[PDB]
């Protein structure tokens, strides 16, 4: 019958959730199989040394169960975020919320809240929670005049609720505002870079506010994020026409409005040169959608804008993000399958050969193994000569940037009009409650300048890793050759892209983490954790610069202030000096403080590349070492126990079948789910 798109969403979601689950199943089965066989190893012809795969496959499975689509819902004050969500999840839940709220599936309506001032994760009931954590439009505009946070004792609150949408694997993060303090919090907790998509609610009666346009630039622009812009309260446009019942006039006003959003959002709706504006921007009437879902949740929403929007989001999540993520699981399973497969194909034959003939064959390949180690060294160098070059060139960029900011300060000092909270200043006394006060006053300035640079930084670190990838690809290709030989000189018989395993990780085609510190958006969930780590330290930098230029000018200021309240200095006499002193002190230290500060940025860029090196290293040594033990364990047995060669044959032939069997089920689940899409 009339299949509403709200059904299609729940359907697809459910479907995926099944593929996800079924793979999880095979993955364990696969792990359990490689594992049992490996334990039997010592009591037989020795282990095959497949522990790295067991582990990897095990994490992969555990990841698959905890799988979920995270959506970050951003939006300014009173735009409809609340009503919007209710409409989306078909309930009148949120109150038509002054604190980051994570909405997730749960059996009972519960609400636990995590603090930051120390307090251990409390607990409450939505009934009381709704009253304890909210703000009247009055005392909320008040905590706005000072750009302060509502409850800084809270990091975020979680809300479990029986909502079928959340059941099928959806988590919602509802951000309370666009201000900068709340911004960092979200950035620091991950979110902005730990969610599959961003839902940025806007309103037709307030087209791309300065507040919005600013946020977009400081936190979204060129950061490679998927964000759908929902122009809410679209229905209001017509309640202002000469004739609110003239589709032609209406259309014309809507058009006036539409060229405004396009002008400001086009820039954010493109993917690799291709423009997808109308698959990301949606004119909506949340109030009309909600109303309809209140008379019947299986209600058709055509006319509210929702359908068109939901189908895009459905597609993105279930036919793109799921595929990519699922595909990786297949890749990991094929790796496990092959390593096992080949390992066995190498052993069975060596089982017949005698200890002497064996060590002769093993020594035969010693030169090949060392070559592998040549790659492990040749690539490690390059890896490090890249961190060094990068951690240098960037530190330079920052140092140079901070300094040069001083050449424009005057003009900027005017554009931004730092407001100093006189109460915050005096109030306490800690050499922090006084510096924070000044730090706040320069919040917008710090954020802006700060966000701009890290964009530039990231654009480079990206390319770096993009090269290292291409590099690993080739080293991987040769590594394989050297590997093929080790098999031939051992066995006698010479046996997606099929590069080695460690190569798969180094290229960012695979990964067990949702995110990583390189530009690998095809790895894991794709999440860019270097926007966190980077655009956080940089703030400490550009802020320290202030925290520094602060202690630099206090003295000169205090002098002027003091030399006036006593009468030693007259009006405008101290100002021809405060300056004389300022300029003097700055040109006397700024360059040093810049340099001193650009040393934190150094450690951050060095870190990015040290994580990568640390991992790629593990995996490569891990390969080398296992292939070698593969051979050593045999000898350790031929000289110690006595194996029944034919029973070993079945046991290992069995191992091989059982694993492949599992891989196929997975390969199927994937193919089927894909094919289903071929016909829909």
Ligand X SMILES: Nc1nc2c(ncn2[C@@H]2O[C@H](COP(=O)(O)OP(=O)(O)O)[C@@H](O)[C@H]2O)c(=O)[nH]1
Q: Which residues bind ligand X (CB under 6 A)?
A: 75, 77-83, 96, 232-233, 235-236, 239-240, 285-287
Per CB under 8 A, contacts with a copy of itself among 137-166 are: 137-138, 141-142, 145-146
Q: Does 209 bind a copy of itself (CB under 8 A)?
A: yes
Q: Are strands 170-174 and 101-105 parallel, antiparallel or unpaired?
A: antiparallel
Question: From CA 379, how far away is CA 621, in angstroms rounded?
Answer: 12
455 close to 489: Cβ distance less than 8 angstroms = no
Report the nearest approach of a copy of itself to the CB of residue 225 (Å): 25
Report the nearest approach of a copy of itself to the CB of residue 260 (Å): 12
Q: Residue from 423, 640, 646, 680 that binds a copy of itself (CB under 8 A)?
A: 423
643: nearest Cα among 41, 227, 239, 114: 41
- Measured from the CB atom, the residue of 294 and 557 that comes closer to ligand X is 294
Question: From CA 612, how far away is CA 377, in angstroms rounded?
Answer: 15
Which range touches a copy of itself (CB under 8 A), out of 204-212, 366-374, 605-613, 625-633?
Answer: 204-212
- Measured from the CB atom, the residue of 183 and 192 that comes closer to a copy of itself is 183
Identify the helix (H) or strand (E) that includes residue 352: helix 322-352
Question: From CA 393, how far away is CA 139, in angstroms rounded?
Answer: 48
332: nearest Cα among 84, 79, 73, 510: 510
Question: From CA 491, how far away is CA 151, in angstroms rounded?
Answer: 68
Question: From CA 535, how far away is CA 547, in angstroms rounded?
Answer: 18
Question: From CA 479, how far away is CA 231, in angstroms rounded?
Answer: 53
Q: Residue from 420, 587, 625, 675 that binds a copy of itself (CB under 8 A)?
A: 420
Neighbouring CB atoms inside 10 A of 552's CB total 17
Locate 223 and state its tokens: 């950061």
Q: Does 679 bind a copy of itself (CB under 8 A)?
A: no
242 binds, among a copy of itself, ligand X, none (CB under 5 to 8 A by kind): a copy of itself
Q: Residue from 93, 521, 553, 643 that binds a copy of itself (CB under 8 A)?
A: 553
Per CB under 8 A, contacts with a copy of itself among 578-637 are: 578
279: nearest Cα among 318, 325, 314, 237: 314
- Measured from the CB atom, the residue of 61 and 83 that comes closer to ligand X is 83
Q: Does 441 bind a copy of itself (CB under 8 A)?
A: yes
Quote the DSSP letter at residue 320. I
256 binds, among a copy of itself, ligand X, none (CB under 5 to 8 A by kind): none
φ, ψ of residue 232 to 5 degrees: the values are -85, 170
405: nearest Cα among 577, 562, 541: 541
339: nearest Cα among 51, 59, 618: 51
- Measured from the CB atom, the residue of 420 and 463 that comes closer to a copy of itself is 420
- Measured from the CB atom, the residue of 428 and 647 that comes closer to a copy of itself is 428
Per-residue contact string for residues 280-309; x = within reach of a copy of itself by CB under 8 A: -------x---x--x---------------
Q: Residue from 413, 456, 470, 641 that binds a copy of itself (CB under 8 A)?
A: 413
Which range touches a copy of itself (CB under 8 A), out of 155-163, 399-407, 411-419, 463-471?
Answer: 411-419
Neighbouring CB atoms inside 10 A of 527's CB total 24
Per CB under 8 A, contacts with a copy of itself among 558-587 are: 558-566, 570-576, 578
79 binds, among ligand X, a copy of itself, none (CB under 5 to 8 A by kind): ligand X
Q: Does 408 bind a copy of itself (CB under 8 A)?
A: no
429 binds, among a copy of itself, ligand X, none (CB under 5 to 8 A by kind): a copy of itself
Q: Which residues bind a copy of itself (CB under 8 A)?
A: 137-138, 141-142, 145-146, 206, 209-210, 235-236, 239-240, 242, 287, 291, 294, 413-414, 417-424, 426, 428-432, 434, 441, 551-566, 570-576, 578
């Amino acid at each position: 019958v009339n299949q509403v798109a709200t059904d299609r969403f729940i359907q697809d979601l459910e479907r995926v959730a099944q593929v996800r689950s079924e793979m999880s199943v095979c993955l364990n089965k696969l792990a359990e199989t490689i594992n049992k066989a490996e334990l039997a190893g010592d009591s037989s012809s020795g282990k095959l040394s497949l522990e790295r795969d067991i582990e990897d496959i095990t994490i992969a499975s555990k990841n698959l169960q905890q799988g979920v689509f995270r959506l970050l819902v951003l939006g300014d004050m009173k735009r409809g975020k609340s009503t919007f969500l209710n409409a989306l999840i078909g309930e009148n839940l949120l109150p038509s919320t002054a604190v980051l709220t994570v909405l997730r599936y749960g059996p009972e309506k519960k609400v636990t809240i995590h603090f930051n001032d120390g307090k251990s994760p409390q607990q409450l009931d939505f009934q009381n929670f709704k009253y304890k954590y909210t703000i009247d439009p009055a005392e909320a505009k008040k905590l706005e005049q000072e750009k302060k946070q509502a409850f800084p004792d809270v990091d975020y609150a979680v809300v479990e609720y029986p909502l079928t949408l959340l059941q099928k694997g959806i988590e919602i993060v509802d951000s309370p505002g666009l201000n900068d303090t709340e911004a960092r919090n979200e950035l620091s907790l991950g979110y902005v870079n730990n969610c599959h998509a961003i839902l940025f609610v806007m309103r037709a009666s307030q087209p791309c506010t300065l507040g919005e346009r600013r946020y977009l630039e400081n936190y979204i622009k060129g950061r490679g994020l998927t964000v759908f812009f929902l122009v809410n309260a679209w229905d209001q446009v017509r309640e202002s026409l000469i004739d609110p019942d003239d589709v032609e006039e209406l259309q014309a006003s809507e058009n006036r409005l539409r060229q405004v959003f396009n002008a400001n959002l086009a820039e954010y709706c493109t993917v690799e040169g291709q423009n997808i504006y109308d698959e990301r921007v949606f004119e909506l009437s949340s109030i009309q959608a909600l109303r309809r879902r209140l008379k019947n949740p299986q209600a058709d929403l055509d006319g509210t804008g929702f359908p068109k929007f939901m189908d895009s989001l459905n597609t993105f999540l279930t036919r793109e993000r799921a595929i990519a993520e699922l595909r990786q699981v297949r890749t990991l399973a094929r790796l496990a399958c092959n390593h096992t497969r080949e390992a066995v194909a190498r052993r069975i034959p060596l089982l017949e050969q005698d200890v002497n003939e064996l060590k002769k064959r093993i020594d035969s390949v010693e030169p090949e193994f060392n070559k592998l180690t040549g790659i492990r060294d040749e690539f490690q160098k390059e890896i490090i000569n890249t961190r060094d070059t990068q951690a240098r060139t960037i530190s330079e960029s920052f140092r140079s940037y901070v300094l040069n900011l001083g050449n424009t300060f005057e003009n900027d000092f005017l554009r931004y009009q730092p407001e100093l909270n006189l109460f915050d200043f005096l109030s306490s006394g800690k050499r922090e409650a006084f510096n924070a006060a000044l730090q706040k006053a320069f919040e917008q300035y710090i954020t802006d300048k700060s966000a701009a640079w890290t964009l530039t930084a990231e654009k480079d670190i990206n390319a770096a890793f993009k090269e290292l990838s291409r590099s690993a690809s080739q080293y991987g290709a040769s590594y394989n050759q050297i590997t093929d030989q080790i098999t031939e000189k051992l066995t006698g018989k010479d046996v997606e892209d099929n590069s080695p395993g460690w190569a798969k990780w180094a290229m960012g085609l695979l990964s067990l983490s949702k995110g990583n510190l390189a530009g690998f958006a095809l790895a894991g969930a794709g999440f860019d954790w270097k926007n966190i780590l980077l655009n956080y330290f940089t703030v400490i930098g550009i802020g320290g610069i202030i925290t520094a230029v602060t202690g630099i000018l206090l003295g000169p200021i205090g002098f002027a202030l003091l030399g006036l309240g006593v009468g030693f200095l007259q009006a405008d006499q101290a100002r021809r000096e405060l300056v004389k002193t300022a300029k003097k002190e700055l040109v006397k230290h700024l360059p040093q403080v810049a340099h001193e500060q650009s040393q934190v940025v150094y450690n951050a860029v060095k870190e990015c590349f040290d994580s990568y090196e640390r991992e790629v290293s593990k995996r490569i040594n891990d390969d080398i070492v296992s292939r070698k033990s593969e051979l050593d364990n045999l000898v350790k047995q031929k000289q110690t126990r006595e194996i029944n060669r034919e029973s070993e044959f079945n046991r290992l032939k069995n191992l091989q079948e059982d694993v492949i069997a599992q891989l196929q089920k997975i390969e199927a689940a994937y193919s089927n789910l894909l094919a289903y899409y071929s016909h829909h």
